[PDB]
Structure 1
Amino acid sequence: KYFMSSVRRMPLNRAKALCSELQGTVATPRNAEENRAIQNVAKDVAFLGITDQRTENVFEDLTGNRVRYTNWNEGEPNNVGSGENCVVLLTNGKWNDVPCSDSFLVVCEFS
């Protein structure tokens, strides 16, 4: 896997379209090593290819596969407010669930 970070911020729909444009997908860490690699390429908070849009509190990658490895920041995922169904990687490498309509950097994954 190769990871590339965007320079501009955007909602998940646009982030997905960006990674897809170059035939990749939004980065999904499967272990601590991939998590670190993604953190290092990201200079700020960035979207990961994980959501619980289909079923609340059931986090899966953009292809419907349930994720095994997680690295939630203490207190997350909390689905605050009207709902948080997307996931971002904070600058310390931990994850936070956020609204899919908010804007963050994106890290794309390629094989």
Structure 2
Amino acid sequence: ASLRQQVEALQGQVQHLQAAFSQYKKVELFPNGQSVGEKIFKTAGFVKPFTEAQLLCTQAGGQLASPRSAAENAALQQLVVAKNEAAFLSMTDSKTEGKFTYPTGESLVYSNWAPGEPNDDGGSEDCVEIFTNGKWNDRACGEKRLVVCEF
């Protein structure tokens, strides 16, 4: 009877938290984030070379943007369009030239290369940028691109 009165209070608390949390997620994602499935992309809103970008994401407890499907790529592309700045992806062929891999070593399960890419231009393009059109180009890791992490 008193337990029932307290379960009712606890029900009220949980329902309030569900509503407040849903409101808060919207606020957080505006304007630098995108939710797609169970993944969230967030941009830092500035540019860094690959190594520095990579470390920013890992230290934040995530990793560089790693679009694994067309839906993930479109969500990422919204951030790129919004900032009007091409972004680094996480993937490189630093280990084996011509074989792009995730930071875990896993081979790519999805790609969205621009026509003729990857072309290892100048024999030194081992990182990947995503353009405002969502297409990918291999690019030198030392260039500065928009930092976008995934969580």
> TM-score, normalization: structure 2?
0.71
- Structure with greater contact order relative to length (CA < 8 Å, sep ≥ 6): 1
**1:1-111 mapped onto 2 (5 Å cutoff):** 1-42=39-80, 43=83, 44-110=85-151
CA RMSD of aligned residues (A): 0.9
Identity %: 46
For structure 2, the residue ranges without an aligned partner over 5 or more in a row are 1-38
Structure 1 stretches of 4+ with a deviation exceeding 3 A read: none
Deviations 1:74-97 (A, max 9, x none): 121010014100001011000000
Shift of 1:107: 1.2
Paired amino acid for 1:54: K
For structure 1, the residue ranges without an aligned partner over 5 or more in a row are none
CA distance in 2, matches of 1:38, 1:14: 20
SS in 2 for 1:84: coil
Question: Higher helix share goes to which structure?
Answer: 2
| Aligned positions, number | 110
> TM-score, normalization: structure 1?
0.95
Shift of 1:106: 1.7
SS in 1 for 2:90: strand
CA distance in 2, matches of 1:49, 1:15: 9
CA distance in 2, matches of 1:73, 1:6: 25
Tell which structure's C-alpha radius of gyration is larger: 2
Shift of 1:39: 0.8
CA distance in 2, matches of 1:85, 1:106: 17
SS in 1 for 2:74: helix
Paired amino acid for 2:53: A
CA distance in 1, matches of 2:150, 2:129: 14
